[PDB]
Amino acid sequence: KVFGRCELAAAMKRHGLDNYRGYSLGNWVCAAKFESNFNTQATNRNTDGSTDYGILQINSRWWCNDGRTPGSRNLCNIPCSALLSSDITASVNCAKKIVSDGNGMNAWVAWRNRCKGTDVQAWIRGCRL
């Protein structure tokens, strides 16, 4: 599913991401934009042989099982394919664990390099929230 911007903002808010660990909703929407272009089906291989999955490009090195990332953990206890669903529940629940783990949203390279320190509120401007 390719979410609309406000559509995703509303789903993220419903699942409890607005100000989760102090990150305003626009941070999450911005992160999704530059990680996946709001496409739940996005997948991207990493050089280390892990793969990033879904709207927030969650990495199989630590967070989900894809059966082809040796030595990896599955800290969200899910198949990586669950992160590709039109229903973002699994992605959001896993993202909550990730962002709680000490480095916050710096976990997400696209957030650090494209969202952090910018006017992230622009990503929810106009949305009925």
mmCIF file of all heavy atoms in Angstrom, residues 1-3 8 12 28-46 51-60 63-64 66 78-92 94-95 98 108 110:
data_model
loop_
_atom_site.group_PDB
_atom_site.id
_atom_site.type_symbol
_atom_site.label_atom_id
_atom_site.label_comp_id
_atom_site.label_asym_id
_atom_site.label_seq_id
_atom_site.Cartn_x
_atom_site.Cartn_y
_atom_site.Cartn_z
ATOM 1 N N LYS A 1 0.868 -1.217 0.000
ATOM 2 C CA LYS A 1 0.000 0.000 0.000
ATOM 3 C C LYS A 1 0.873 1.223 0.000
ATOM 4 O O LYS A 1 1.839 1.278 0.787
ATOM 5 C CB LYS A 1 -0.872 -0.002 1.251
ATOM 6 C CG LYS A 1 -1.742 1.232 1.443
ATOM 7 C CD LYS A 1 -2.601 1.100 2.689
ATOM 8 C CE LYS A 1 -3.344 2.385 3.003
ATOM 9 N NZ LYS A 1 -4.526 2.557 2.143
ATOM 10 N N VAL A 2 0.553 2.182 -0.875
ATOM 11 C CA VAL A 2 1.208 3.473 -0.869
ATOM 12 C C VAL A 2 0.255 4.407 -0.140
ATOM 13 O O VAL A 2 -0.813 4.747 -0.663
ATOM 14 C CB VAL A 2 1.573 3.949 -2.283
ATOM 15 C CG1 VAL A 2 2.202 5.332 -2.261
ATOM 16 C CG2 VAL A 2 2.561 2.976 -2.915
ATOM 17 N N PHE A 3 0.598 4.755 1.098
ATOM 18 C CA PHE A 3 -0.183 5.694 1.884
ATOM 19 C C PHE A 3 -0.069 7.093 1.336
ATOM 20 O O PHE A 3 0.967 7.506 0.831
ATOM 21 C CB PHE A 3 0.296 5.774 3.340
ATOM 22 C CG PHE A 3 -0.230 4.694 4.219
ATOM 23 C CD1 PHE A 3 0.354 3.441 4.255
ATOM 24 C CD2 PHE A 3 -1.301 4.923 5.042
ATOM 25 C CE1 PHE A 3 -0.136 2.442 5.100
ATOM 26 C CE2 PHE A 3 -1.805 3.933 5.876
ATOM 27 C CZ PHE A 3 -1.225 2.686 5.903
ATOM 28 N N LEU A 8 -1.261 8.409 6.292
ATOM 29 C CA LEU A 8 -0.264 7.789 7.169
ATOM 30 C C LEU A 8 -0.189 8.514 8.510
ATOM 31 O O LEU A 8 -0.117 7.869 9.546
ATOM 32 C CB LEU A 8 1.102 7.760 6.502
ATOM 33 C CG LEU A 8 2.169 7.043 7.314
ATOM 34 C CD1 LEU A 8 1.816 5.590 7.560
ATOM 35 C CD2 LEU A 8 3.489 7.166 6.551
ATOM 36 N N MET A 12 -0.583 6.561 12.004
ATOM 37 C CA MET A 12 0.481 6.623 12.988
ATOM 38 C C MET A 12 -0.029 7.188 14.310
ATOM 39 O O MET A 12 0.305 6.682 15.384
ATOM 40 C CB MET A 12 1.655 7.431 12.438
ATOM 41 C CG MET A 12 2.444 6.687 11.387
ATOM 42 S SD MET A 12 3.805 7.715 10.786
ATOM 43 C CE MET A 12 4.961 6.470 10.314
ATOM 44 N N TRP A 28 7.886 11.141 12.615
ATOM 45 C CA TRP A 28 7.545 9.808 12.113
ATOM 46 C C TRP A 28 7.150 9.836 10.632
ATOM 47 O O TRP A 28 7.526 8.955 9.866
ATOM 48 C CB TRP A 28 6.445 9.195 12.980
ATOM 49 C CG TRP A 28 6.903 8.985 14.387
ATOM 50 C CD1 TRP A 28 6.594 9.744 15.481
ATOM 51 C CD2 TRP A 28 7.744 7.939 14.854
ATOM 52 N NE1 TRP A 28 7.195 9.239 16.593
ATOM 53 C CE2 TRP A 28 7.920 8.132 16.241
ATOM 54 C CE3 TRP A 28 8.393 6.865 14.230
ATOM 55 C CZ2 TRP A 28 8.705 7.290 17.024
ATOM 56 C CZ3 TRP A 28 9.181 6.018 15.018
ATOM 57 C CH2 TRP A 28 9.331 6.251 16.406
ATOM 58 N N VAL A 29 6.317 10.808 10.256
ATOM 59 C CA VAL A 29 5.894 10.942 8.862
ATOM 60 C C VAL A 29 7.099 11.261 7.960
ATOM 61 O O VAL A 29 7.254 10.674 6.881
ATOM 62 C CB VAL A 29 4.760 11.978 8.716
ATOM 63 C CG1 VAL A 29 4.401 12.146 7.246
ATOM 64 C CG2 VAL A 29 3.549 11.531 9.525
ATOM 65 N N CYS A 30 7.955 12.195 8.403
ATOM 66 C CA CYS A 30 9.158 12.528 7.677
ATOM 67 C C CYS A 30 10.043 11.278 7.507
ATOM 68 O O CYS A 30 10.535 11.000 6.411
ATOM 69 C CB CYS A 30 9.926 13.646 8.390
ATOM 70 S SG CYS A 30 11.360 14.258 7.485
ATOM 71 N N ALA A 31 10.213 10.525 8.585
ATOM 72 C CA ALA A 31 11.039 9.321 8.525
ATOM 73 C C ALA A 31 10.476 8.354 7.489
ATOM 74 O O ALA A 31 11.215 7.837 6.648
ATOM 75 C CB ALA A 31 11.114 8.655 9.879
ATOM 76 N N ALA A 32 9.157 8.148 7.514
ATOM 77 C CA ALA A 32 8.529 7.233 6.548
ATOM 78 C C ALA A 32 8.688 7.726 5.116
ATOM 79 O O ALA A 32 8.903 6.922 4.193
ATOM 80 C CB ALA A 32 7.055 6.998 6.867
ATOM 81 N N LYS A 33 8.554 9.039 4.909
ATOM 82 C CA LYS A 33 8.688 9.593 3.575
ATOM 83 C C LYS A 33 10.030 9.208 2.977
ATOM 84 O O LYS A 33 10.099 8.737 1.852
ATOM 85 C CB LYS A 33 8.564 11.107 3.606
ATOM 86 C CG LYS A 33 8.925 11.791 2.310
ATOM 87 C CD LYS A 33 7.984 11.476 1.192
ATOM 88 C CE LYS A 33 8.491 12.134 -0.084
ATOM 89 N NZ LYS A 33 7.574 11.865 -1.216
ATOM 90 N N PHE A 34 11.095 9.463 3.720
ATOM 91 C CA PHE A 34 12.424 9.290 3.146
ATOM 92 C C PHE A 34 12.966 7.877 3.289
ATOM 93 O O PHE A 34 13.910 7.510 2.592
ATOM 94 C CB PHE A 34 13.356 10.350 3.691
ATOM 95 C CG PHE A 34 12.965 11.738 3.271
ATOM 96 C CD1 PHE A 34 12.635 12.716 4.208
ATOM 97 C CD2 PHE A 34 12.900 12.068 1.930
ATOM 98 C CE1 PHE A 34 12.281 14.001 3.798
ATOM 99 C CE2 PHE A 34 12.558 13.342 1.518
ATOM 100 C CZ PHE A 34 12.237 14.310 2.454
ATOM 101 N N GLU A 35 12.357 7.075 4.153
ATOM 102 C CA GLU A 35 12.713 5.648 4.211
ATOM 103 C C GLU A 35 12.060 4.840 3.095
ATOM 104 O O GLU A 35 12.702 3.996 2.478
ATOM 105 C CB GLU A 35 12.363 5.054 5.585
ATOM 106 C CG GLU A 35 13.233 5.501 6.770
ATOM 107 C CD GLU A 35 14.705 5.081 6.655
ATOM 108 O OE1 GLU A 35 15.017 4.270 5.776
ATOM 109 O OE2 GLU A 35 15.529 5.536 7.463
ATOM 110 N N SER A 36 10.765 5.053 2.876
ATOM 111 C CA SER A 36 9.967 4.164 2.019
ATOM 112 C C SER A 36 9.150 4.885 0.973
ATOM 113 O O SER A 36 8.492 4.246 0.189
ATOM 114 C CB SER A 36 9.006 3.370 2.868
ATOM 115 O OG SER A 36 8.053 4.196 3.466
ATOM 116 N N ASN A 37 9.117 6.214 1.010
ATOM 117 C CA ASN A 37 8.178 6.964 0.188
ATOM 118 C C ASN A 37 6.733 6.546 0.454
ATOM 119 O O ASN A 37 5.896 6.569 -0.440
ATOM 120 C CB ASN A 37 8.537 6.945 -1.298
ATOM 121 C CG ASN A 37 8.004 8.160 -2.015
ATOM 122 O OD1 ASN A 37 7.572 9.127 -1.382
ATOM 123 N ND2 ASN A 37 7.988 8.110 -3.328
ATOM 124 N N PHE A 38 6.461 6.210 1.725
ATOM 125 C CA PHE A 38 5.142 5.840 2.220
ATOM 126 C C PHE A 38 4.606 4.509 1.660
ATOM 127 O O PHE A 38 3.405 4.242 1.748
ATOM 128 C CB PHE A 38 4.082 6.947 1.948
ATOM 129 C CG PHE A 38 4.402 8.315 2.500
ATOM 130 C CD1 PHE A 38 4.014 9.428 1.802
ATOM 131 C CD2 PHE A 38 4.968 8.490 3.755
ATOM 132 C CE1 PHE A 38 4.218 10.701 2.333
ATOM 133 C CE2 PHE A 38 5.194 9.750 4.285
ATOM 134 C CZ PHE A 38 4.819 10.857 3.562
ATOM 135 N N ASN A 39 5.511 3.689 1.115
ATOM 136 C CA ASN A 39 5.161 2.421 0.493
ATOM 137 C C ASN A 39 5.418 1.292 1.489
ATOM 138 O O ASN A 39 6.576 0.988 1.807
ATOM 139 C CB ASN A 39 5.991 2.226 -0.770
ATOM 140 C CG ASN A 39 5.610 0.973 -1.555
ATOM 141 O OD1 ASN A 39 4.755 0.195 -1.163
ATOM 142 N ND2 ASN A 39 6.253 0.795 -2.689
ATOM 143 N N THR A 40 4.350 0.652 1.969
ATOM 144 C CA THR A 40 4.491 -0.466 2.909
ATOM 145 C C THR A 40 5.302 -1.638 2.325
ATOM 146 O O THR A 40 5.865 -2.432 3.084
ATOM 147 C CB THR A 40 3.154 -1.033 3.411
ATOM 148 O OG1 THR A 40 2.470 -1.717 2.356
ATOM 149 C CG2 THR A 40 2.268 0.032 4.020
ATOM 150 N N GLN A 41 5.338 -1.776 0.996
ATOM 151 C CA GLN A 41 6.011 -2.908 0.396
ATOM 152 C C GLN A 41 7.486 -2.682 0.153
ATOM 153 O O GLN A 41 8.147 -3.574 -0.347
ATOM 154 C CB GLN A 41 5.333 -3.307 -0.916
ATOM 155 C CG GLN A 41 3.881 -3.689 -0.747
ATOM 156 C CD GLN A 41 3.329 -4.376 -1.979
ATOM 157 O OE1 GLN A 41 2.532 -3.801 -2.751
ATOM 158 N NE2 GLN A 41 3.767 -5.587 -2.200
ATOM 159 N N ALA A 42 8.015 -1.501 0.491
ATOM 160 C CA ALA A 42 9.413 -1.201 0.206
ATOM 161 C C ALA A 42 10.383 -2.184 0.898
ATOM 162 O O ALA A 42 10.253 -2.460 2.084
ATOM 163 C CB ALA A 42 9.759 0.208 0.639
ATOM 164 N N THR A 43 11.346 -2.675 0.137
ATOM 165 C CA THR A 43 12.437 -3.491 0.654
ATOM 166 C C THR A 43 13.742 -3.003 0.058
ATOM 167 O O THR A 43 13.800 -2.653 -1.128
ATOM 168 C CB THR A 43 12.263 -5.003 0.354
ATOM 169 O OG1 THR A 43 12.259 -5.243 -1.062
ATOM 170 C CG2 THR A 43 11.030 -5.553 0.986
ATOM 171 N N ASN A 44 14.814 -3.014 0.853
ATOM 172 C CA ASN A 44 16.101 -2.569 0.357
ATOM 173 C C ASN A 44 17.191 -3.388 1.045
ATOM 174 O O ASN A 44 17.245 -3.465 2.264
ATOM 175 C CB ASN A 44 16.336 -1.085 0.630
ATOM 176 C CG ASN A 44 15.428 -0.190 -0.187
ATOM 177 O OD1 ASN A 44 14.453 0.381 0.317
ATOM 178 N ND2 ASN A 44 15.736 -0.085 -1.442
ATOM 179 N N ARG A 45 18.036 -4.007 0.249
ATOM 180 C CA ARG A 45 19.161 -4.778 0.780
ATOM 181 C C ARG A 45 20.264 -3.875 1.275
ATOM 182 O O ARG A 45 20.599 -2.877 0.655
ATOM 183 C CB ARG A 45 19.738 -5.713 -0.292
ATOM 184 C CG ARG A 45 20.598 -6.863 0.264
ATOM 185 C CD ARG A 45 19.690 -7.860 0.959
ATOM 186 N NE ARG A 45 20.280 -9.084 1.501
ATOM 187 C CZ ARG A 45 20.465 -10.243 0.854
ATOM 188 N NH1 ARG A 45 20.186 -10.415 -0.441
ATOM 189 N NH2 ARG A 45 20.950 -11.257 1.519
ATOM 190 N N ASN A 46 20.828 -4.256 2.405
ATOM 191 C CA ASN A 46 22.002 -3.592 2.954
ATOM 192 C C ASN A 46 23.281 -4.347 2.577
ATOM 193 O O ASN A 46 23.273 -5.565 2.305
ATOM 194 C CB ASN A 46 21.839 -3.499 4.475
ATOM 195 C CG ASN A 46 20.579 -2.801 4.881
ATOM 196 O OD1 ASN A 46 20.243 -1.717 4.357
ATOM 197 N ND2 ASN A 46 19.886 -3.373 5.861
ATOM 198 N N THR A 51 18.385 -6.856 5.299
ATOM 199 C CA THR A 51 17.425 -6.152 4.450
ATOM 200 C C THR A 51 16.557 -5.287 5.346
ATOM 201 O O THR A 51 16.264 -5.665 6.487
ATOM 202 C CB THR A 51 16.561 -7.161 3.666
ATOM 203 O OG1 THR A 51 17.399 -7.983 2.855
ATOM 204 C CG2 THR A 51 15.526 -6.507 2.733
ATOM 205 N N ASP A 52 16.161 -4.130 4.813
ATOM 206 C CA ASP A 52 15.235 -3.217 5.485
ATOM 207 C C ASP A 52 13.847 -3.383 4.883
ATOM 208 O O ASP A 52 13.721 -3.462 3.652
ATOM 209 C CB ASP A 52 15.672 -1.774 5.282
ATOM 210 C CG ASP A 52 16.884 -1.372 6.078
ATOM 211 O OD1 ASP A 52 17.381 -2.165 6.899
ATOM 212 O OD2 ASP A 52 17.319 -0.192 5.883
ATOM 213 N N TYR A 53 12.831 -3.413 5.744
ATOM 214 C CA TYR A 53 11.451 -3.729 5.342
ATOM 215 C C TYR A 53 10.435 -2.678 5.755
ATOM 216 O O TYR A 53 10.389 -2.273 6.912
ATOM 217 C CB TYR A 53 11.048 -5.041 6.016
ATOM 218 C CG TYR A 53 11.848 -6.225 5.533
ATOM 219 C CD1 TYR A 53 13.036 -6.578 6.137
ATOM 220 C CD2 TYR A 53 11.410 -7.000 4.460
ATOM 221 C CE1 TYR A 53 13.776 -7.670 5.683
ATOM 222 C CE2 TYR A 53 12.131 -8.080 4.009
ATOM 223 C CZ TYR A 53 13.320 -8.415 4.623
ATOM 224 O OH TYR A 53 14.027 -9.487 4.139
ATOM 225 N N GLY A 54 9.579 -2.319 4.806
ATOM 226 C CA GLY A 54 8.362 -1.623 5.128
ATOM 227 C C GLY A 54 8.467 -0.120 5.197
ATOM 228 O O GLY A 54 9.479 0.473 4.839
ATOM 229 N N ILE A 55 7.404 0.463 5.751
ATOM 230 C CA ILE A 55 7.189 1.896 5.786
ATOM 231 C C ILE A 55 8.327 2.625 6.524
ATOM 232 O O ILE A 55 8.665 3.765 6.194
ATOM 233 C CB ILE A 55 5.793 2.154 6.435
ATOM 234 C CG1 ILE A 55 5.265 3.553 6.164
ATOM 235 C CG2 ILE A 55 5.739 1.755 7.906
ATOM 236 C CD1 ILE A 55 4.357 3.569 4.967
ATOM 237 N N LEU A 56 8.920 1.949 7.515
ATOM 238 C CA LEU A 56 10.012 2.528 8.295
ATOM 239 C C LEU A 56 11.317 1.761 8.125
ATOM 240 O O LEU A 56 12.285 2.019 8.844
ATOM 241 C CB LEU A 56 9.632 2.680 9.778
ATOM 242 C CG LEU A 56 8.627 3.799 10.086
ATOM 243 C CD1 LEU A 56 8.070 3.613 11.507
ATOM 244 C CD2 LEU A 56 9.300 5.159 9.935
ATOM 245 N N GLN A 57 11.374 0.872 7.130
ATOM 246 C CA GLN A 57 12.634 0.250 6.716
ATOM 247 C C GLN A 57 13.384 -0.402 7.890
ATOM 248 O O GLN A 57 14.568 -0.150 8.134
ATOM 249 C CB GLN A 57 13.487 1.246 5.963
ATOM 250 C CG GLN A 57 12.902 1.570 4.628
ATOM 251 C CD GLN A 57 12.955 0.392 3.680
ATOM 252 O OE1 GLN A 57 11.932 -0.341 3.490
ATOM 253 N NE2 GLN A 57 14.112 0.147 3.124
ATOM 254 N N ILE A 58 12.660 -1.256 8.588
ATOM 255 C CA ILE A 58 13.160 -1.925 9.782
ATOM 256 C C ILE A 58 14.080 -3.060 9.344
ATOM 257 O O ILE A 58 13.785 -3.797 8.404
ATOM 258 C CB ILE A 58 11.998 -2.372 10.660
ATOM 259 C CG1 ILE A 58 11.346 -1.110 11.270
ATOM 260 C CG2 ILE A 58 12.425 -3.408 11.696
ATOM 261 C CD1 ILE A 58 10.027 -1.332 11.961
ATOM 262 N N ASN A 59 15.206 -3.158 10.038
ATOM 263 C CA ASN A 59 16.341 -3.984 9.613
ATOM 264 C C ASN A 59 16.359 -5.374 10.210
ATOM 265 O O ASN A 59 16.267 -5.524 11.418
ATOM 266 C CB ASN A 59 17.617 -3.225 10.008
ATOM 267 C CG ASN A 59 18.877 -3.743 9.347
ATOM 268 O OD1 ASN A 59 18.978 -4.865 9.018
ATOM 269 N ND2 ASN A 59 19.880 -2.898 9.246
ATOM 270 N N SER A 60 16.507 -6.371 9.337
ATOM 271 C CA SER A 60 16.527 -7.765 9.724
ATOM 272 C C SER A 60 17.775 -8.149 10.536
ATOM 273 O O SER A 60 17.780 -9.221 11.124
ATOM 274 C CB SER A 60 16.424 -8.670 8.500
ATOM 275 O OG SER A 60 17.567 -8.524 7.677
ATOM 276 N N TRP A 63 15.855 -6.901 14.122
ATOM 277 C CA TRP A 63 14.480 -6.645 14.565
ATOM 278 C C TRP A 63 13.436 -7.638 14.089
ATOM 279 O O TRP A 63 12.377 -7.760 14.692
ATOM 280 C CB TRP A 63 14.058 -5.220 14.190
ATOM 281 C CG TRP A 63 14.979 -4.208 14.793
ATOM 282 C CD1 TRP A 63 15.905 -3.494 14.135
ATOM 283 C CD2 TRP A 63 15.109 -3.854 16.179
ATOM 284 N NE1 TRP A 63 16.610 -2.705 15.001
ATOM 285 C CE2 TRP A 63 16.132 -2.900 16.264
ATOM 286 C CE3 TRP A 63 14.433 -4.223 17.345
ATOM 287 C CZ2 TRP A 63 16.505 -2.314 17.465
ATOM 288 C CZ3 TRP A 63 14.804 -3.647 18.525
ATOM 289 C CH2 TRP A 63 15.837 -2.699 18.577
ATOM 290 N N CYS A 64 13.693 -8.291 12.967
ATOM 291 C CA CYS A 64 12.730 -9.216 12.395
ATOM 292 C C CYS A 64 13.475 -10.371 11.750
ATOM 293 O O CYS A 64 14.658 -10.263 11.450
ATOM 294 C CB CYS A 64 11.814 -8.521 11.394
ATOM 295 S SG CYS A 64 12.614 -7.832 9.930
ATOM 296 N N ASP A 66 13.967 -12.755 8.552
ATOM 297 C CA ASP A 66 13.720 -12.980 7.116
ATOM 298 C C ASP A 66 14.334 -14.291 6.603
ATOM 299 O O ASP A 66 14.293 -14.559 5.410
ATOM 300 C CB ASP A 66 14.133 -11.795 6.242
ATOM 301 C CG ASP A 66 15.608 -11.533 6.204
ATOM 302 O OD1 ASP A 66 16.411 -12.356 6.718
ATOM 303 O OD2 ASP A 66 15.970 -10.509 5.558
ATOM 304 N N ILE A 78 8.905 -11.214 14.926
ATOM 305 C CA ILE A 78 7.996 -11.217 13.782
ATOM 306 C C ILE A 78 8.764 -11.618 12.536
ATOM 307 O O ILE A 78 9.969 -11.308 12.427
ATOM 308 C CB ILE A 78 7.359 -9.820 13.473
ATOM 309 C CG1 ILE A 78 8.431 -8.711 13.452
ATOM 310 C CG2 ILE A 78 6.224 -9.497 14.428
ATOM 311 C CD1 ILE A 78 7.940 -7.393 12.909
ATOM 312 N N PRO A 79 8.066 -12.237 11.562
ATOM 313 C CA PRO A 79 8.657 -12.326 10.233
ATOM 314 C C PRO A 79 8.760 -10.941 9.621
ATOM 315 O O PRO A 79 7.884 -10.120 9.804
ATOM 316 C CB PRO A 79 7.672 -13.189 9.440
ATOM 317 C CG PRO A 79 6.391 -13.052 10.139
ATOM 318 C CD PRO A 79 6.666 -12.697 11.574
ATOM 319 N N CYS A 80 9.823 -10.701 8.879
ATOM 320 C CA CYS A 80 10.014 -9.413 8.243
ATOM 321 C C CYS A 80 8.876 -9.080 7.275
ATOM 322 O O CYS A 80 8.518 -7.925 7.120
ATOM 323 C CB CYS A 80 11.348 -9.353 7.550
ATOM 324 S SG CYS A 80 12.782 -9.428 8.653
ATOM 325 N N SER A 81 8.278 -10.102 6.680
ATOM 326 C CA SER A 81 7.175 -9.918 5.773
ATOM 327 C C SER A 81 5.973 -9.248 6.448
ATOM 328 O O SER A 81 5.206 -8.557 5.773
ATOM 329 C CB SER A 81 6.753 -11.245 5.156
ATOM 330 O OG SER A 81 6.338 -12.146 6.143
ATOM 331 N N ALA A 82 5.825 -9.424 7.768
ATOM 332 C CA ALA A 82 4.732 -8.736 8.502
ATOM 333 C C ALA A 82 4.883 -7.213 8.464
ATOM 334 O O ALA A 82 3.892 -6.452 8.617
ATOM 335 C CB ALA A 82 4.679 -9.208 9.940
ATOM 336 N N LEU A 83 6.108 -6.764 8.232
ATOM 337 C CA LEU A 83 6.389 -5.342 8.098
ATOM 338 C C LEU A 83 6.031 -4.754 6.719
ATOM 339 O O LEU A 83 6.215 -3.560 6.496
ATOM 340 C CB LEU A 83 7.853 -5.058 8.460
ATOM 341 C CG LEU A 83 8.319 -5.501 9.847
ATOM 342 C CD1 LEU A 83 9.841 -5.420 9.916
ATOM 343 C CD2 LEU A 83 7.700 -4.627 10.915
ATOM 344 N N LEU A 84 5.516 -5.580 5.798
ATOM 345 C CA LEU A 84 5.158 -5.160 4.451
ATOM 346 C C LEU A 84 3.635 -5.025 4.204
ATOM 347 O O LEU A 84 3.202 -4.614 3.106
ATOM 348 C CB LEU A 84 5.767 -6.117 3.430
ATOM 349 C CG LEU A 84 7.285 -6.292 3.482
ATOM 350 C CD1 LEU A 84 7.734 -7.261 2.404
ATOM 351 C CD2 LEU A 84 8.027 -4.967 3.324
ATOM 352 N N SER A 85 2.852 -5.346 5.230
ATOM 353 C CA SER A 85 1.402 -5.356 5.159
ATOM 354 C C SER A 85 0.805 -3.961 4.954
ATOM 355 O O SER A 85 1.368 -2.979 5.390
ATOM 356 C CB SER A 85 0.872 -5.940 6.474
ATOM 357 O OG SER A 85 -0.522 -5.907 6.514
ATOM 358 N N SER A 86 -0.367 -3.891 4.345
ATOM 359 C CA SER A 86 -1.119 -2.632 4.304
ATOM 360 C C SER A 86 -1.499 -2.128 5.712
ATOM 361 O O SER A 86 -1.633 -0.929 5.916
ATOM 362 C CB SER A 86 -2.359 -2.772 3.424
ATOM 363 O OG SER A 86 -3.191 -3.784 3.918
ATOM 364 N N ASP A 87 -1.652 -3.048 6.661
ATOM 365 C CA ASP A 87 -1.904 -2.745 8.078
ATOM 366 C C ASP A 87 -0.549 -2.465 8.746
ATOM 367 O O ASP A 87 0.289 -3.358 8.844
ATOM 368 C CB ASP A 87 -2.566 -3.962 8.739
ATOM 369 C CG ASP A 87 -2.867 -3.775 10.217
ATOM 370 O OD1 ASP A 87 -2.318 -2.879 10.874
ATOM 371 O OD2 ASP A 87 -3.684 -4.564 10.732
ATOM 372 N N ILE A 88 -0.349 -1.251 9.227
ATOM 373 C CA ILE A 88 0.959 -0.846 9.779
ATOM 374 C C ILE A 88 1.184 -1.214 11.241
ATOM 375 O O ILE A 88 2.219 -0.854 11.811
ATOM 376 C CB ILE A 88 1.251 0.660 9.592
ATOM 377 C CG1 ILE A 88 0.317 1.546 10.422
ATOM 378 C CG2 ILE A 88 1.207 1.031 8.120
ATOM 379 C CD1 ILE A 88 0.758 2.983 10.543
ATOM 380 N N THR A 89 0.253 -1.947 11.855
ATOM 381 C CA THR A 89 0.382 -2.282 13.267
ATOM 382 C C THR A 89 1.749 -2.884 13.651
ATOM 383 O O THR A 89 2.385 -2.412 14.582
ATOM 384 C CB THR A 89 -0.744 -3.236 13.714
ATOM 385 O OG1 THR A 89 -2.014 -2.628 13.469
ATOM 386 C CG2 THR A 89 -0.621 -3.550 15.194
ATOM 387 N N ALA A 90 2.197 -3.906 12.930
ATOM 388 C CA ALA A 90 3.463 -4.565 13.244
ATOM 389 C C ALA A 90 4.656 -3.624 13.111
ATOM 390 O O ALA A 90 5.533 -3.608 13.966
ATOM 391 C CB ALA A 90 3.648 -5.802 12.387
ATOM 392 N N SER A 91 4.663 -2.827 12.055
ATOM 393 C CA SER A 91 5.728 -1.822 11.876
ATOM 394 C C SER A 91 5.767 -0.822 13.029
ATOM 395 O O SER A 91 6.853 -0.482 13.531
ATOM 396 C CB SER A 91 5.621 -1.104 10.534
ATOM 397 O OG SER A 91 6.143 -1.934 9.490
ATOM 398 N N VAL A 92 4.601 -0.306 13.401
ATOM 399 C CA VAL A 92 4.531 0.659 14.491
ATOM 400 C C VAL A 92 4.982 0.038 15.816
ATOM 401 O O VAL A 92 5.758 0.651 16.561
ATOM 402 C CB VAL A 92 3.131 1.281 14.610
ATOM 403 C CG1 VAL A 92 3.020 2.100 15.891
ATOM 404 C CG2 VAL A 92 2.839 2.122 13.375
ATOM 405 N N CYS A 94 6.966 -2.509 16.328
ATOM 406 C CA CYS A 94 8.399 -2.720 16.273
ATOM 407 C C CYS A 94 9.160 -1.391 16.345
ATOM 408 O O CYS A 94 10.140 -1.291 17.086
ATOM 409 C CB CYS A 94 8.763 -3.508 15.007
ATOM 410 S SG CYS A 94 10.451 -4.094 14.966
ATOM 411 N N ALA A 95 8.681 -0.364 15.632
ATOM 412 C CA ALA A 95 9.309 0.953 15.684
ATOM 413 C C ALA A 95 9.357 1.522 17.120
ATOM 414 O O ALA A 95 10.332 2.174 17.524
ATOM 415 C CB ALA A 95 8.580 1.912 14.763
ATOM 416 N N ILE A 98 12.283 -0.058 18.802
ATOM 417 C CA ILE A 98 13.518 0.472 18.257
ATOM 418 C C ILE A 98 13.845 1.835 18.856
ATOM 419 O O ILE A 98 14.929 2.067 19.358
ATOM 420 C CB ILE A 98 13.429 0.568 16.715
ATOM 421 C CG1 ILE A 98 13.327 -0.834 16.088
ATOM 422 C CG2 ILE A 98 14.643 1.282 16.175
ATOM 423 C CD1 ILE A 98 12.953 -0.820 14.623
ATOM 424 N N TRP A 108 17.320 5.455 12.487
ATOM 425 C CA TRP A 108 16.898 5.609 11.084
ATOM 426 C C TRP A 108 17.783 6.619 10.343
ATOM 427 O O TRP A 108 17.739 7.821 10.617
ATOM 428 C CB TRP A 108 15.418 6.008 11.004
ATOM 429 C CG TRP A 108 14.500 4.904 11.371
ATOM 430 C CD1 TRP A 108 14.105 3.867 10.549
ATOM 431 C CD2 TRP A 108 13.819 4.708 12.609
ATOM 432 N NE1 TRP A 108 13.258 3.027 11.220
ATOM 433 C CE2 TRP A 108 13.074 3.498 12.492
ATOM 434 C CE3 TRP A 108 13.802 5.392 13.827
ATOM 435 C CZ2 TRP A 108 12.277 3.009 13.520
ATOM 436 C CZ3 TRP A 108 13.018 4.882 14.875
ATOM 437 C CH2 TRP A 108 12.279 3.696 14.716
ATOM 438 N N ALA A 110 17.701 7.807 7.337
ATOM 439 C CA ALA A 110 16.979 8.839 6.600
ATOM 440 C C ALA A 110 16.434 9.920 7.564
ATOM 441 O O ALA A 110 16.403 11.120 7.220
ATOM 442 C CB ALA A 110 15.858 8.228 5.779
#
